[PDB]
């Protein structure tokens, strides 16, 4: 396995990341109390406790969002997937940044993602589970959205609306993309043979 393309053309990493992002997003929504705790049930993933919503439409929304993220991952068009927490005025208060690098060549010397996927991804999940300790209290009535930072260069004349797998997406406006000099809180970094991923939170200063 010399190359990224050897792992089913990026499909393996995309699938593993989408499975991971779904569980991480649910856990974020729980620990930050974006939704009432009563919709979340306790499950196990990566042999560690996780908290997953049983609300059908919220579930489907998260899945639909990640269904759009998957092809972007496969074509190596993702630098970040960000869970953005918005206050009641719709201003970012907090961002959970999953910064992803998929180099074209596998790093020979790093540990095998696929042999240790449980342990490696569990470590992120465990940091999310207890992150409420290190973050500020969010104001009441927060919502979330998901921002995808792509590898694509912006062109002068580009349509704001971009349809992906039949769902309309939009170029993110400065209200969401910009936080004024946020405080950066590191949670976890991993370098594996196939994937480099860093999780950190940006909080409003």
């Amino acid at each position: 396995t010399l190359t990224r393309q050897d792992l089913n053309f990026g499909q393996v990493v995309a699938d593993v990341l989408c499975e991971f992002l779904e569980v991480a997003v649910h856990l974020i929504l729980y620990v930050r109390e974006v939704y009432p705790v009563g919709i979340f049930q306790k499950r196990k993933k990566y042999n560690v406790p996780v908290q997953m919503s049983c609300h059908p439409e919220l579930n489907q929304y998260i899945q639909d969002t990640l269904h759009c993220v998957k092809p972007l991952l496969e074509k190596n068009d993702v630098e970040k997937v960000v869970v953005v927490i918005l206050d009641k005025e719709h201003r970012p208060v907090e961002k959970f940044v999953f910064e992803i690098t998929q180099p074209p060549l596998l790093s020979i010397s790093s540990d095998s993602l696929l042999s240790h996927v449980e342990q490696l991804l569990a470590a992120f999940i465990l940091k999310i589970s207890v992150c409420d300790a290190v973050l500020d209290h969010n104001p009441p009535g927060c919502t979330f959205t998901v921002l995808v930072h792509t590898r694509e260069a912006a062109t002068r004349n580009m349509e704001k609306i971009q349809v992906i797998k039949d769902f309309p997406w939009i170029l993110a406006d400065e209200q969401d993309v910009h936080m004024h000099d946020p405080r950066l809180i590191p949670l976890k970094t991993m370098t594996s043979d196939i994937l480099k991923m860093q999780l950190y939170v940006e909080e409003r200063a």
């Binding site: 998260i62 979330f144 959205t145 912006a154 769902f167």
Partner: peptide
């Protein structure tokens, strides 16, 4: 050079819609 950053046009279900579903059982 700036890259394309995108978000869904539609919001996730509101907290209140979920509260109502929960309270209904």
């Amino acid at each position: 050079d700036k890259k394309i950053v995108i978000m869904p046009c539609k919001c996730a279900p509101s907290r209140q819609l979920v509260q109502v579903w929960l309270q209904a059982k």
